[PDB]
Amino acid sequence: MALYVSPIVSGEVIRSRGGSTSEFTPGYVKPKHEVNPQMTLRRLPDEDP
Amino acid sequence: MALYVSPIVSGEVIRSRGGSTSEFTPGYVKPKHEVNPQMTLRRLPDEDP
Numbered sequence: 001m002a003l004y005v006s007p008i009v010s011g012e013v014i015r016s017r018g019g020s021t022s023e024f025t026p027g028y029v030k031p032k033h034e035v036n037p038q039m040t041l042r043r044l045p046d047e048d049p
Numbered sequence: 050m051a052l053y054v055s056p057i058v059s060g061e062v063i064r065s066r067g068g069s070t071s072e073f074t075p076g077y078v079k080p081k082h083e084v085n086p087q088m089t090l091r092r093l094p095d096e097d098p
Contacts, residue, residue: 031051033063045067 005011043049054060092098 028053028056029051030054030056030060031063032060033065036065045069 051060
């Protein structure tokens, strides 16, 4: 804060401030999915008969 | 989901979707009526005498 150093002593020296780092590197996602080429033979729920 | 697959273990295959039905034929209705031209001689409740 400041507290009260008297005008007869030098006083203490404050450490200024600062210093904080961090890392958040990798991440990933990959939704592979199949087309199923033999699924197209039968009738889909759509595509009215 | 496709959560978090790392990019050396490329990943797994999903099965997409599909399927539903129902059956109900037409239904039917027919209200027959008659005209019977022999009952037109007597006056209607309308058609003041």
